[PDB]
Amino acid sequence: MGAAELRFCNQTIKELMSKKHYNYNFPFLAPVDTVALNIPNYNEIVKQPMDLGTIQSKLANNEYENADDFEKDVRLVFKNCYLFNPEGTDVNMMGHRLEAVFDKKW
Ligand SMILES: Cc1ccc(Nc2c(-c3ccc(O)cc3)nc3c(C)cccn23)cc1
């Protein structure tokens, strides 16, 4: 990825993970802990799990060849959120509001 595009992806993922947005990013900072959350059906429902911490790692390890691949993974976090968490639930609302932060920056 180009240098300026890489810098912008890094700024974007750090913005999404920052404590400034803790109230709506905390469920998405690390892979879903299906044992701690008692959700064995998460792996049966969500076939391509993704989280912000994994995206940050993939970025640092040169696994996004352009910004579009980076965006696809960010969108996947929210797609999985809306699939597993029904509309109206607390985590679903957090996904909507964090994706709005991404839309504004991106
Ligand atoms: C029985 C049940 C129902 C809903 C949830 N949602 C949920 C998720 C979650 C995040 C992303 C995702 O793609 C799927 C689930 N993260 C949490 C956390 C950190 C605390 C409490 C609930 N949480 C957990 C258990």
* CA neighbor of 29 nearest in space, from 100, 91, 106, 89: 91
**b/e sequence 20-47, b meaning 16+ C-beta within 10 Å:** ebeebbebbeeebeeeeeeeeebeeebe
Rg of the Cα trace of the chain? 14
- For the Cβ of 94 lying below 6 angstroms from any atom of ligand 1, the answer is no
Return the structure tokens found at 18: 């920052």
- For the Cβ of 81 lying below 6 angstroms from any atom of ligand 1, the answer is yes
How many angstroms is it from 29 CA to the middle of ligand 1? Answer: 12
CB of 55 closer than 8 Å to CB of 77? yes
CATH 1.20.920.10 fits 1-106, yes or no: yes
CB of 8 closer than 8 Å to CB of 67? yes
Q: Kindly provide the resolution of this structure in angstroms, with one decimal.
A: 1.5
- For the Cβ of 56 lying below 6 angstroms from any atom of ligand 1, the answer is no
- For the Cβ of 30 lying below 6 angstroms from any atom of ligand 1, the answer is no
Instruction: Give the contacts of 17 (CB within 8 A, at least 6 positions apart).
Output: 25, 29, 52, 53, 56
Q: Whose CA is nearest to atom 25 of ligand 1?
A: 37
For 29-76, the DSSP string reads SS---TTTTT-TTHHHH-SS---HHHHHHHHHTT--SSHHHHHHHHHH
Return the domain boundaries, the chain. 1-106
Cβ burial of 64 (10 Å; 0-12, 13-18, 19+) is buried
- For the Cβ of 55 lying below 6 angstroms from any atom of ligand 1, the answer is no
Which uninterrupted H or E stretch holds 5? helix 3-17
**Virtual torsion, Cα 89, 93, 94, 97, nearest 10 deg:** 180
